[PDB]
Each structure stands twice: as C-alpha cells, then as structure tokens.
C-alpha cells in the first residue's frame, strides 16, 4: 500500500523507537533527579511564545475546557503566532524599520563580541 509512504514511516519508527528504548534504559541505571524534573520543566517553560500565556493560566484554574474546547483553543493562539511570524519575516519585527531588515538579511552586522566580554 504505497510503499513510497511506508519507507519514511519505517525509518521514523526505527528512530523514535530507538530513542525511547534508550531513554528508558538510561533512566533505570540512572534514576532521574526528583527535583530537577521541575528544572527541565522550567527550561521548556522558558521557550513557549507569548501568544499562549492568555490560555496557559486559564488551564490552571479549571476555566479552560473539557478536552476538545481546549484543542480548538490552542489553534487560535497558534494561528495568531503564525501570522505574527509571517509579518515579522516579510515586513519586519515590532521595533525595526525596513533598513533593519535589510541589514538583518544581508548579514552586515557581526554578533556583538566586545559587549559579551
């Protein structure tokens, strides 16, 4: 049944299954820290866009949903973030004109080295 689709699924199954087996066997010989499981949670917490915070707290206080009212809630924040990204890519960010986009995509300005030391 359309092997041209089965082969990527086969390699994907292999990769993901090997990763899961590895993490399993790795947190057995080394049990995970009972507190830095919160630290990795904080690390992934620091990476979420802002368009989702208006939903996030709403999930803590019950208000949010049953199970699907949520799944259609995340789509709105998602598409808001998506259209913001389209705008930033094409016409620029929130605080930069067209010249700043030109110097961004021409790589005229080095990463600031003097400041970081």
Partner 1 sequence: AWQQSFETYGGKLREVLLGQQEAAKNVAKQLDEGVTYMDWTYRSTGVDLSAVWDPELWIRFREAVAQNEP
Partner 2 sequence: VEAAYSAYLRRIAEAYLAEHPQMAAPEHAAHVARVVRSRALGTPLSFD
Q: Using CB under 8 A, list all residues that contact partner 1.
A: 8, 11-12, 15-16, 18-19, 22, 28-30
User: CA 86, CA 46: separation in Å to the nearest integer?
Assistant: 22
Closer Cβ to partner 1, 29 or 46, answer by number: 29
Question: What is the closest distance, in whole angstroms, from the C-beta atom of residue 52 to partner 1 in the complex?
Answer: 22
Residue 15 site contact among partner 1, partner 2, none (CB < 5 to 8 Å, cut-off depends on kind) = partner 1
Least Å distance, CB 40 to partner 1, is 15
8 or 110: CB nearest partner 2? 110
Q: Return the number of the residue (3 or 113) whose C-beta is nearest partner 2.
A: 113
Work out the burial of residue 51: count CB atoms within 10 Å of its CB; fewer than 13 is exposed, 13-18 middle, 19 or more buried: middle
Q: Closer to partner 2 at the Cβ: 48 or 103?
A: 103
Query: What residues have CB less than 8 Å from 56, skipping those under 6 apart?
Result: 48
Question: In sequence order, which ranges of 1-117 are alpha helices (DSSP H)?
Answer: 3-29, 36-45, 53-60, 68-71, 73-91, 98-105
Task: Return phi, psi of residue 14, to 5°.
Answer: -60, -50
Q: How far is the CB of 26 from partner 2 (least distance, A)?
A: 41
């Amino acid at each position: 049944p359309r092997l041209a689709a089965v082969m990527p699924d086969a390699v994907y199954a292999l990769v993901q299954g090997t990763h899961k087996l590895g993490e399993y066997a790795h947190d057995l010989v080394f049990p995970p820290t009972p507190e830095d499981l919160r630290k990795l949670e904080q690390q992934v917490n620091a990476t979420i866009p802002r368009e989702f915070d208006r939903v996030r707290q709403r999930y803590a206080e019950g208000k949010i949903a049953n199970d699907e009212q949520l799944s259609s809630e995340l789509e709105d924040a998602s598409f808001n973030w998506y259209r913001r990204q389209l705008r930033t890519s094409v016409v620029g960010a929130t605080d930069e004109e067209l010249e700043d986009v030109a110097v961004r995509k021409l790589r005229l300005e080095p990463p600031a080295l003097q400041a970081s030391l």
